Amino acid sequence: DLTAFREHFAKAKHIAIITGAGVSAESGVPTFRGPGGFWRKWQAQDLATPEAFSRDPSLVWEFYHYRREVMRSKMPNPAHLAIAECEARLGQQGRSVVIITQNIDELHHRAGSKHVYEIHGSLFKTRCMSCGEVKANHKSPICPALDGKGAPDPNTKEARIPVELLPRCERKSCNGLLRPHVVWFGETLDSDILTAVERELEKCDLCLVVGTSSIVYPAAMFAPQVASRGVPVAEFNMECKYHFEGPCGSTLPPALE
């Protein structure tokens, strides 16, 4: 019931919106998981691991370079936009909106959202393997050796880039190998981010779960905490307290206007 949801929306002073893979899938963002979602001969399970990076950093960087570069042609969708406009509009009224996203593509930021927690990191951040520095990086290509590399076609040869020519840390003294600042399979979420998320979720008086569900990770980490405060939760997804079935780019903008 959209009207009942909107009655809560009109009164809520602090909205937390959790976004999952569904909202990035509607922008056409490949993630390489499952049904013939291949990059050359591999899937994300093979590459998005510290062991793959340790064994073949050039191959893993080709894969991340490809992913960075495809984002030039993948755009924010109406769900991203509605969420950013809603944040701006409510902020002007002294009402707060925060986004907790599992997505690493920065589409929320390209849509105009400010208060965003990236629990899995970003394709457009690097972390230095040596000094640990995390930095924004949108450079195309990230390093000259990767220029024109990363093609997904199974026939493509490996670039076999020497490790010293992959992205390096720019502090002259350091020059460590950079890795994508993304949470890989088998790795832990950042505790500081989770603390901040918990504070937002404790404060919130309405919670939306978009392009994933309350019962799965990562929403399942916190959604019980919010439900037990008596706080309404509204789901927007394509799956079987409120639930709006369909593509988020159709359902969300009318709910948030």
């Binding site: 088998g186 790795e187 990770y217």
Partner: peptide, 8 residues
């Protein structure tokens, strides 16, 4: 620390 996907 929390493993992504709970390690699953």
């Amino acid at each position: 620390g929390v493993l992504k996907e709970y390690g699953v």
